[PDB]
Design a protein around this ligand. Structure first.
Ligand SMILES: [Mg+2]
Lengths: 51, 732
RNA sequence: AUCUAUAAUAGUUUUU
RNA sequence: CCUCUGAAUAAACUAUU
RNA sequence: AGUAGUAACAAGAG
């Protein structure tokens, strides 16, 4: 979390090079979920060992 | 500037940097699924190498058998198994001629070994194909089950405790019309009756599987596991072969390590000195293609028959049984295959017992061809494999055969201006050929090649090469005017063994020391290896230094211990202490190294005999003298000599009841140690039952104590009464 | 000067 | 839904005990 | 999909 905060310039994620055999929207949603849950754990006034 | 590591060889000779050619820092290849394909390929290839032989049907098992002995002489360079019996006999005869009395003395020593060996020798090993369960079991478990079945079938010569009596039991069981065994299911006990042919097929069967974690091979291969009936005969035959090999200079077995390197260097230098100063000398680094698939058990029978001439008949029979059993051997196919349906998205397991009459629409082209070729050989769920030695068996007898061919290279036998000698180890060889000119070298190489062809030995042309004497390779040792060091080969040994904290520390330091002594590991690299090992140890066992802030579940206790301790250097690394090891003290145990730095309370807690992490004895009440547990790499037992858990898979099978049995066995064994203290130290030998021996020992001890005044007459009377009660219980 | 005692554990070597 | 389980070839040699 | 490679995993059983 500390290292993520040190960077400014986040944009809205978009697919630049798609995976031919995959489902790219799933990757995009995975990234969004990671961001959301990072914020969530940051909002619970305690960081656990595992999430 | 593109970096090309290989170009380093333009200045450093390849041998002097050979360790760079071993990529032994990555994980080795593994086998994932079934081994049936490899077993079928091996069987088909073994029969293809002998296709021009004689086909017969075994009258006892009914299995087709192929006999390439005395077959047509080859007309090309393809591998072939048409060994000539007269040539093998002549090779043995000339080997005897060159070393008079070798076979006689070997047979004398082997007769002593055979007459002395005990049955418990069979408990050695890792696994064994148990014919009563059609799968692999621990060697001791397999032996126990076989003894139990034999006792249930009235075959009790093994009670003598001699291995040869167990072999007599095996032979007598071969003649039983029927056999009866017990089977478990969902954990009831049921009885199964095997007719003569079924039991005979089971007795000649070797299980097969795929080998995992082998370096330097792109493709996988099959390995075999012998059954219970054949282990003893193979053991005796290999004892004879070992005795023979110990008396030959060209033999690369059964010596190893520094002694092997010294022997090879001495032999090579003697060959060089014997070479004249006006004749060319060449060395061939050679490999033999499919050694074990071309050697035939019948030729080993012939060799044993020639070796054991003028010997008692019983010795000859007990030695000859092994090749007889191996020429009528069967091969288990394996797990089978797995089928997948994409439309229905399902998977299933197809056992190998169904391959006999399974429709071939499921399989691909290669597997279909394998099954079609191998079907004629299938009987009772196995495959008939008469020719060939399966895998890694009779290594020393093969060494004897190779050394005989090497011995055929003396001038008294070549009868010309060229000659040869060299080193043999199972199937690997180095050949030194001396001749006045190059044409002589060519003639000698050709004669060696053809003589090997006569005895069923094929020299791998694409893996063998020849150069001037002075450099070669033998059994992964690279000789360049002397054997060179190869550190990468032993590199995987560096790390954490996984026994426990104390043993792992000892193993790491000892490995560093030994590689300094042997593999030319330098001082600075030794220090860096020590640092890396301590880092890995701390990370694995969560025992970082107490004055750090590494978050682990064990950090709180270590921090408390660190704070309460006055002498920090006395703490072990397992207790968060510092590292006191350097080059000069790699040979000293850690606890002994810092004994004179430990606090009295910490030292007493560490070496407290009443620590539940190590068991306790029962003499008097408990031997409260030293921490006592099998103490390999653990000189002094402390609280860090704990024992980890056990795998619990069997709990979900029908064999879980066996757990109980072994536990009960331990119980009984424990009691036996209260009567015979030396049993743990040295293995007891006797024919009487455990209860009878214990009762006799109790009576004699009571008499001795009463006579010497150690006990009073009331105790003597009570002990005698209890002994009589035990005698009464014995009958009921 | 010679020097293969046993048993346990782990590691290494032994492909058409 | 719930219970349990996370997978031991042969020979020789090397090291420690 | 992916790991992977001559056969498997992508949980198994009760
Ligand atoms: Mg070779």
């Amino acid at each position: 979390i500390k290292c993520m905060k040190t960077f400014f310039g986040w944009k809205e994620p978009n697919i630049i090079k798609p995976h031919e055999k995959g489902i790219n929207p799933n990757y995009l949603l995975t990234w969004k979920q990671v961001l959301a849950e990072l914020q969530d754990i940051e909002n619970e006034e305690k960081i656990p060992r595992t999430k | 500037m593109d970096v090309n590591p290989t170009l380093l060889f333009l200045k450093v000779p390849v041998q002097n940097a050979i360790s760079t050619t071993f990529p032994y820092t990555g994980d080795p290849p593994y086998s994932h699924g079934t081994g049936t394909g490899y077993t079928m390929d091996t069987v088909n290839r073994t029969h293809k190498y002998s296709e021009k032989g004689k086909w017969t049907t075994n009258t006892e098992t009914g299995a087709p058998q192929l006999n390439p002995i005395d077959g047509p002489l080859p007309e090309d360079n393809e591998p072939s198994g048409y060994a000539q019996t007269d040539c093998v006999l002549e090779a043995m005869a000339f080997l005897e001629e060159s070393h008079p009395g070798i076979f006689e003395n070997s047979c004398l020593e082997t007769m002593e070994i055979v007459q002395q060996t005990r049955v418990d020798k069979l408990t050695q090993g890792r696994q064994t194909y148990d014919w009563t369960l059609n799968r692999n079991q621990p060697a001791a478990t397999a032996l126990a089950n076989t003894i139990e079945v034999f006792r249930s079938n009235g075959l009790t010569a093994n009670e003598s405790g001699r291995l040869i009596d167990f072999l007599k039991d095996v032979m007598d069981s071969m003649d039983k019309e029927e056999m009866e065994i017990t089977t478990h299911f969902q954990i009831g006990k049921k009885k199964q009756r095997l007719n003569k042919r079924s039991y005979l097929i089971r007795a000649l069967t070797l299980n097969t599987m795929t080998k995992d974690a082998e370096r330097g091979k792109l493709k996988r291969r099959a390995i075999a596991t012998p059954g219970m009936q054949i282990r003893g005969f193979v053991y005796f035959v290999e004892a004879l072969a070992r005795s023979i090999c110990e008396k030959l200079e060209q033999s690369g077995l059964p010596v190893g390590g520094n002694e092997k390197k010294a022997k090879l260097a001495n032999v090579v230098r003697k060959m060089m000195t014997n070479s004249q100063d006006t004749e060319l000398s060449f060395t061939i680094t050679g490999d033999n293609t499919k050694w074990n698939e071309n050697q035939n058990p019948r030729m080993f029978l012939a060799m044993i028959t020639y070796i054991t001439r003028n010997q008692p008949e019983w010795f000859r029979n007990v030695l000859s049984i092994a090749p007889i059993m191996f020429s009528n051997k069967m091969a288990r196919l394996g797990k089978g295959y797995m089928f997948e349906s994409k439309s229905m998205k399902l998977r299933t397991q197809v056992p190998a017992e169904m391959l006999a009459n399974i429709d071939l629409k499921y399989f691909n082209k290669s597997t279909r061809e394998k099954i079609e070729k191998i079907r004629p050989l299938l009987i009772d769920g196995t495959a008939s494999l008469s020719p060939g030695m399966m895998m890694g068996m009779f290594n020393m007898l093969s060494t004897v055969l190779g050394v005989s061919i090497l011995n055929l290279g003396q001038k008294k036998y070549t009868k010309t201006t060229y000659w040869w000698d060299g080193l043999q180890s199972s199937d690997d060889f180095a050949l030194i050929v001396n001749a006045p000119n190059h044409e002589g070298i060519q003639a000698g190489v050709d004669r060696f090649y053809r003589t090997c062809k006569l005895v069923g030995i094929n020299m791998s042309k694409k893996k063998s090469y020849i150069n001037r004497t002075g450099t070669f390779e033998f059994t992964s040792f690279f000789y360049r005017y002397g054997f060179v060091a190869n550190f990468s080969m032993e590199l995987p040994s560096f790390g954490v063994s996984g026994i426990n904290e104390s043993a792992d520390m000892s193993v790491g330091v000892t490995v560093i020391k030994n590689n300094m002594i042997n593999n030319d590991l330098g001082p600075a690299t030794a220090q860096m290896a020590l640092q890396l090992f301590i880092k890995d140890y701390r990370y694995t066992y969560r025992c970082h230094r107490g004055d750090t802030q590494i978050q682990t579940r064990r950090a709180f206790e270590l921090k408390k211990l660190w704070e309460q301790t006055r002498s920090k250097a006395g703490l072990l690394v397992s207790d968060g202490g510092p590292n006191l090891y350097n080059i000069r003290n790699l040979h000293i145990p850690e606890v002994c190294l810092k004994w004179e730095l430990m606090d009295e309370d910490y030292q007493g807690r560490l070496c407290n005999p009443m620590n539940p992490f190590v068991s306790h004895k029962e003499i008097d009440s408990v031997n409260n003298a030293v921490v006592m547990p099998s103490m390999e790499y653990d000189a002094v037992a402390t609280t860090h000599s704990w024992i980890p858990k056990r795998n619990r898979s069997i709990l979900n099978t029908s064999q879980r009841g066996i757990l109980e049995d072994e536990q009960m066995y331990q119980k009984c064994c424990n009691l036996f140690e209260k009567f015979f203290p030396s049993s743990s130290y040295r293995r007891p030998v006797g024919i009487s039952s455990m209860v009878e021996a214990m009762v006799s020992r109790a009576r004699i001890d009571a008499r001795i104590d009463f006579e010497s005044g150690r006990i009073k007459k009331e105790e003597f009377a009570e002990i005698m009464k209890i002994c009589s009660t035990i005698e009464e219980l014995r009958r009921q």
